[PDB]
Amino acid sequence: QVQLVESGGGSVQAGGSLRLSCTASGFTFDDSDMGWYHQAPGNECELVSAIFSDGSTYYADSVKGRFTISRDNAKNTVYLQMNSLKPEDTAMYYCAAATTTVASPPVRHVCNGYWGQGTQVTVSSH
């Protein structure tokens, strides 16, 4: 079974940084396009960044230049390096074998915690 385990969230001040990790067991990870999604209270489940199985990437416009997604197939892990954090980045972050931005049942399920518990990111104003 696809099981994702997110970690690396935290509570930081604006301008700070975090590195999220997502370990994948139970599926052909190396063949999967992987995404990081996020949701703050009242917001939709939105894709932050995707890394396709070919190693190319997609970034939401709001995080381009601040966040970097990567994967280590040998460790079945996806990472999200988050620099220059902003209060608006505050959210639960979830990993998934999903890489689309469109609100659809598969995407909504991600931020509902269908595949993993997520990791909390809280960024406080200075």
Structural domains of the chain sorted by starting position, each given as residue range(s) with its CATH number in brackets: 1-126 (2.60.40.10)
Strands 119-124 and 10-13, bridge-based pairing: parallel
Resolution in A: 1.1
CA atoms of 17 and 91, how far apart (whole Å): 14
Q: Nearest-CA neighbor of 24 among 62, 51, 47, 46?
A: 51
What is the side-by-side order of every strand in the sheet holding 3-7? Answer: 3-7, 18-25, 77-82, 67-72
Please give the full DSSP string across the chain, using - where no structure is assigned.
Answer: --EEEEE--EEEETT--EEEEEEEESS-GGG--EEEEEE-TTS--EEEEEE-TTS-EEE-TTTTTTEEEEEEGGGTEEEEEE-S--GGG-EEEEEES----S--HHHHHHHTTSS---EEEEEE--
> Is 20 in contact with 93 (CB distance < 8 Å)?
yes
Main-chain phi, psi angles of 87, to 5 degrees = -55, -35
State the structure-solving technique: X-ray
